[PDB]
Design a protein around this ligand. Structure first.
Ligand SMILES: [Cl-]
Ligand SMILES: [Pr+3]
Lengths: 146, 148
């Protein structure tokens, strides 16, 4: 499953990070794609880099514009083994999304794909509506989607 | 093809790699090097993380210790479309290697795989030999082995 969590400036991050223990406890492997719209010397010289450590691996590579803006390429190439892929932002990709906002009027901004739910403290009309701190229920909602 | 750059000077390995890189790349070779705040928060919470931008992508992910130590596992997941993979270290993995040392007798400590050449300011016996400065010659040597 690929799902976008989108909305206004750090409410999105808190939701993702707070839901994460619950999603992982159910046995999901999860990746999060965040778009920005030494090893540096090596990278800067022309090489893509893997940095390997006992418990963490990092891979930094040049991509063409067409690759870097292509969510489904990124997924097919590197994330095909994951149960759940969540984007933070990547709204233009038109994936089904959860919209996380401060004010209900902001929801309107994010109709670039299908709105599965809205997370807001104030009443949101016209959508399935979760309050920001209902992390368990929102996680359960995502688990239902699969 | 995976080539290790091994030896006694951390800085001299890294310098040889970066000086050679523009020459290797001008041949339209695709090269990768393997070496030993919100995305950090997401990572800590238990997600693997992709940071995407129009021309650069970073994939940060949890591994077991054996996976992270395993060059072939890394090659498969990540590196199968490169024309050349360079390793900075990983001497004990036994890949063919270029050995970069200060003193000729240090060469003896890097015999875990095939020694293709030795980089040393002082002449070394029993191996193909370049000085530290001969970056174009060492780069070409690497291009040559690729074409065989
Ligand atoms: Cl080494
Ligand atoms: Pr309710």
């Amino acid at each position: 499953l690929i799902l976008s969590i989108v909305g206004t400036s750090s409410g999105k991050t808190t939701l993702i990070t707070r839901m994460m223990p619950i999603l992982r406890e159910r046995g999901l492997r999860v990746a999060v794609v965040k778009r920005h719209a030494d090893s540096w010397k090596i990278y800067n010289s022309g090489a893509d880099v893997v940095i390997a450590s006992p418990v963490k691996l990092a891979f930094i590579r040049r991509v063409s514009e067409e690759e870097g803006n292509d969510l489904d390429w990124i997924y097919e190439r590197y994330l095909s083994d994951y149960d759940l892929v969540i984007t933070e932002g990547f709204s233009k990709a038109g994936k089904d999304r959860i919209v996380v906002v401060k004010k209900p009027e902001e929801v309107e901004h994010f109709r670039q794909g299908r709105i599965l739910a809205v997370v807001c403290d104030e009443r949101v009309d016209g959508h399935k509506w979760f309050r920001r701190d209902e992390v368990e229920r929102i996680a359960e909602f995502i688990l239902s989607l699969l």
